[PDB]
Amino acid sequence: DKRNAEYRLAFEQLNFVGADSKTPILKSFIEDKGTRIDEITFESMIPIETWKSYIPQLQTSLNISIISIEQGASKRIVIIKSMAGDAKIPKYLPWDDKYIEEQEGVVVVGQTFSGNIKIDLNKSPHILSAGETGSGKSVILRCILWQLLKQGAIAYMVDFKGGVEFGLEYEKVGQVITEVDAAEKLFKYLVDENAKRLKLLRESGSKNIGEYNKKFEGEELKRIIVVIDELAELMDKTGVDDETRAKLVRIEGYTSTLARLSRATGINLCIGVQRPDAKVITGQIKNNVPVRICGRFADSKASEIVLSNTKAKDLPEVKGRFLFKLGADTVQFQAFYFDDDKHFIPNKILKLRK
């Protein structure tokens, strides 16, 4: 057993032995081939505090990035959460207009171990971005929005916090919705537009809008991008009056309809969530939004609501580091940093539209 031998040598070189004069014995090594976050279990007579003093050295000796070291079942077992030293992903990756894909509908959200995370909205039509305050889960949505705007999409932005998350500059490129009445009128219009698009597809014998657009020289349907800054603002009906609750009941239905039926019509939903709750990230939403982008959560319950797994509690504490899920994949990636002050240039969008 080569690996066991290598570790024994690395610890012997450090004279890293317990009160029994024994180097740590390797017990388990559970590896995640998607996130590249391993779980390394050891049995030693060495206190956890000595292991933590050796973090810098142990990283170089074992050639791993240590995320955490913690005590297990007994004060004789330690668990190391780590990534291999050869599993390099940047800790900082700024956005560059060079990452924009020429293929209409394709977006790039960041970098994984080998290459970029690309989402084809013609295949995976909706994106859910989950993350706590200061994670950068909204930076991802504005990045996606930028790329789609650069490809000539029509945009709608939903933020009931008076549109702070999308100021005056965003209003030059699209409609910023800040009230429940405007959201109800918007979502009703979106369900109706979607229904008109479906009948165009059925009538013309087209599989998607791309095919329909080939058939009609001057009647081209544009991709509609809808950015919902906070899903809970639409889904939580508590503490509102009878009238407002009924408006939110109806918006919940329009959103369900859109997520389910807007697949080949080019009407994409990019939803932000801060607090994973099954009353917000509903069975209907989860079943119809294939892409999940997830920041680090301390509670495995929060991660299970978003990803149907506990991997988001294992993420490194690096700002911009996220998990990407599409079907069977739960992949670690460093999101591009889309800085509004440097990167959101509204006049480039207005020039390209002609």
Ligand X SMILES: Nc1ncnc2c1ncn2[C@@H]1O[C@H](COP(=O)(O)OP(=O)(O)OP(O)(O)=S)[C@@H](O)[C@H]1O
Ligand Y SMILES: OC[C@H]1O[C@@H](O)[C@H](O)[C@@H](O)[C@@H]1O
335 known member of a binding site: yes
Contact between 343 and 131 (Cβ < 8 Å): no
Q: How far is CA 318 from the centre of its chain?
A: 15
Contact between 273 and 231 (Cβ < 8 Å): yes
Pick from ligand Y, ligand X, none: which does 138 bind, CB < 5 to 8 A by kind? ligand X
When asked if residue 33 is in the footprint of ligand Y (CB under 6 A), the reply is no
Q: Is 119 left (phi over 0), alpha (psi -120 to 50) or beta?
A: beta
Pick from ligand Y, ligand X, none: which does 335 bind, CB < 5 to 8 A by kind? ligand X
Contact between 138 and 272 (Cβ < 8 Å): yes
- Where do contacts with ligand X occur on this chain (CB under 6 A)? 92, 131, 133-139, 319-320, 335-337
User: How many residues at the interface with ligand Y, by CB under 6 A?
Assistant: 12
Q: Which residues on adjacent β-strands are paired with residue 332?
A: 323
DSSP calls for 43-110: E-SS-HHHHHHTHHHHHHHHTEEEEEEEE-SSTTEEEEEEEETT----S--B--GGG--SSTTEEEEE
Pick from ligand Y, ligand X, none: which does 189 bind, CB < 5 to 8 A by kind? ligand Y
Q: How far apart are CA 112 and CA 324, in angstroms?
A: 9
* Contacts with ligand Y, 125-164, as mask; x by CB under 6 A: ----------------------------------------
Give the β-pairing of 116-120 and 106-111. antiparallel
Pick from ligand X, ligand Y, none: which does 329 bind, CB < 5 to 8 A by kind? ligand Y
Q: Pick from 41, 59, 61, 175: which binds ligand Y (CB under 6 A)?
A: 175
When asked if residue 331 is in the footprint of ligand Y (CB under 6 A), the reply is yes
135 known member of a binding site: yes
Q: How far is the CB of 241 from ligand Y (least distance, A)?
A: 22
Choice between 64 and 141, CB closer to ligand X: 141
Residues interacting with ligand Y, by CB under 6 A? 112, 115-118, 175, 185-186, 189, 326, 329, 331
